[PDB]
Amino acid sequence: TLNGGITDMLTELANFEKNVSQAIHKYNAYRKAASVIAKYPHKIKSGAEAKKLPGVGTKIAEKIDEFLATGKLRKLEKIRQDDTSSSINFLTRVSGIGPSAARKFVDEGIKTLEDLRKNEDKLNHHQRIGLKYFGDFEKRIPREEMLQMQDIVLNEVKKVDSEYIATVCGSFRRGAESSGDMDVLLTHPSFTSESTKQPKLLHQVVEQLQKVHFITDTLSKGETKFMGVCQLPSKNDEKEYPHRRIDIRLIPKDQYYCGVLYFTGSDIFNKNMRAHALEKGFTINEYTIRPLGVTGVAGEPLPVDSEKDIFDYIQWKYREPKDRSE
DNA sequence: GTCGG
DNA sequence: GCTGATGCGCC
DNA sequence: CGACGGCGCATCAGC
Ligand SMILES: *CC[C@H](OP(*)(=O)O)[C@H](O)COP(=O)(O)O
Ligand SMILES: [Mg+2]
Ligand SMILES: [Mg+2]
Ligand SMILES: [Mg+2]
Known part of the structure; x- marks a missing residue:
């Protein structure tokens, strides 16, 4: 729990700016500071010490001085009473x-x-x-349940069409001991950046997961993204498992590496990496990495044959999934 | 709220 | 109907 | 002082 007091303070401030203030850049600023401080391998002893970290400026330094002197923040004290x-x-x-x-x-x-x-x-x-x-x-879902959930999804997808590949991404692919939800990246050879040669590719998978009573509710559903609710089956006379959030993203099969990079995260890592890409004159989305032309208009998609190729383009040393967490 | 022209 | 803006969601 | 990541789906206003 190193600098746990400080990172908890910054997260609470982020959530306030997001939820109450509707100030998305202040939210992102607080979370970037929280993530950089979480990674810092020393007990922060001063605001001045923290201010040396990228993402920590004068205002966060002052709050950290307040928090280390008093163990609280009067701003947060007042928000909590509002x-x-x-x-x-x-x-x-x-x-x-x-x-x-x-x-x-x-x-x-x-x-x-x-x-x-x-x-x-x-x-x-x-x-x-x-x-x-x-x-x-x-x-949170224990990694043990995430493995049982993986087994049902991968096995049920194989039953619809052995050509589907399903990959569990998010915190699970980063090797977390627990996950907020289940994020599934789906590919089929009939869906590429060039052609949709078969309709209902995502629908057929959702339908099979409904049929075996794994998916229990739908929040939203289009051609490429499913957002819903799932539940592990329980034994005779056992308490039911909690219902869980499931996201399923169907990605063009030729754009798998951009897709798996996006869906592995973390969110803060994605924002840091895409912001760096812009500094290096590239734009990254879940489909492509493209150069920025003279104007600031994105050019043609660059060749990508691995996650690491995306890192190479923006001149970052490769980070394994496990090193992309907060 | 912070960073870099 | 369609298109474009916005809210809320994903990492 | 401008920029801050980028996009899918649900919903609604205006034509
Ligand atoms: C945390 C202190 C604030 O930094 P930001 O530009 O949100 C301000 O210095 C104080 O503003 P307040 O929110 O009106 O207290
Ligand atoms: Mg997740
Ligand atoms: Mg999710
Ligand atoms: Mg998440």
Whole structure:
């Protein structure tokens, strides 16, 4: 838990700026600072010491001085006592209630868990499922359950078409001991950057996972991205496993490396790496790495035959998945 | 909130 | 219907 | 002082 006090302070400040202030760049600034301090292999003894790290400026240095002197932050003390703030911070924990919906709900007097359950007809489909599994979704998944979930998905995908490849990404591919959810990258040879030679490629997989009662609910679904809910089967007379979030992303098979880089994360690593790419005159998305032309208009996709090729282009030494976490 | 022209 | 803007989601 | 990562799906306004 080294500099755990400081990183917890910065995360709380980030969530405030995101949820209450709707200040996305302040949110990103706080999380970048939190991530760089988490990686620092010494007990920070001063704001001046922290300020030497990239992402920590004058204002974060001053808060760290306050926090090390007093073990708290008066700004955070006040946010915690503010009723609108604490109402908004609570509601934003429901899947599908963002900053705008939370403030809207608070404006209608809907501020608590009881208030939401009374007001189900005021909730869209996503929000109703977020409410139904509120408690379940705050639970982390042990790596042991992630391996059982992997076995069901990979085995069920093989049953639809042996040409599908399914890869579990997110914190699981980074080798975390627990995961917030299950992120699945899907490829099929019939879907490339050049041609969709078969329709319902994602649909057929979702349908098989519904048929064996693994996928239990849908939050959203298009041609390339599924967002839903799944659950491990339980034994005779055992308590049921919690319901879990599942994301499935179908990526063009020739663009697998850009796709697996994106879907492995972490989010903060992606933002740091894409920001660095821009500094080096390249743009990275889940599909391609492209050069920026004279104008600032992206050029043709560069050849990529490995994750490492993307690192090479922007002149970074390769980071294994396990080294891309916070 | 921070960084780099 | 379509297109473009916005909210909320993913890493 | 401008830029800050990039894009999928749901929803709604305007034509
Ligand atoms: C943490 C201190 C703040 O840094 P940012 O530009 O959010 C400001 O210095 C104080 O502003 P406040 O939020 O009005 O206290
Ligand atoms: Mg995840
Ligand atoms: Mg996910
Ligand atoms: Mg995540």
